[PDB]
Symmetry: D2
Subunit: 74 residues, 4 copies
């Protein structure tokens, strides 16, 4: 049971995190670093592997930020 601050550090280190309140085992969020792609530089962002096994751009809600039921998933 971690707060969002330590879950954010885990994200910035490349780890996967999830919430017990999400009610979705298999769901995890991860951090995508920024990069340069006549060259375009992309900002870092957060992503989520959903229950539909697809990738979606993720923005934490206020409940996610205030929650203290975070866990690091392998």
């Amino acid at each position: 049971s971690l707060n969002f601050g330590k879950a954010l550090e885990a994200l910035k280190e490349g780890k996967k995190v999830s919430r017990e309140g999400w009610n979705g085992k298999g769901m995890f969020a991860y951090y995508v670093p920024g990069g340069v792609y006549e060259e375009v530089k992309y900002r870092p962002y957060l992503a989520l592997k959903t229950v539909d096994n697809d990738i979606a751009t993720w923005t934490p809600s206020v409940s996610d930020i205030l929650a203290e039921d975070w866990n690091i998933v392998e």
Copy 2:
């Protein structure tokens, strides 16, 4: 300058936080505790019940001295330029 994890700690303790670009704009965020409010109208009771419980949330004083119930953006969460503002 602090990361968002330490800024969230100051928020939960009743302090005000702000990013570097917000000073001069009068902007800061603060934490509002949750509560329980009693329903008055039957239409409110028929949808929410006799009582309605609100979760804790965050507020943000904008540049116009008006208050917005705030959801931090990804750039705010990934930023490391937060400060405790007195």
Copy 3:
């Protein structure tokens, strides 16, 4: 099944909206209007002023019968499975 543009118009009209694709069932979002209120202490008046204007925002009745501040995700905005809930 509506897109988010028509669900937003329903929100601004005071209606409640929900998505079929949401895993949590029984949830809906609704529109909270803005307001202006009187300050009750010197600490607020010396930081805000006499009147505090509050911006409108969106709330979500969760599966716990709780009220949380809500910001739609990108998937919510692009989805076309919205309906008005009575």
Copy 4:
């Protein structure tokens, strides 16, 4: 002066949109279609920011409620 519902339709039709309240010339958002052991990614939104960098953008509630959107040519 369009609301977000018509700006979203312009996004889904491949157009660029921006706000007046953004108070930033050159900033615009656009729609990126979804696509593809193998990983499937959903369609999302991108924003050309103030420093010529591209971010994966989610509209704030103020952006969704604002009615100052335009189509950027």
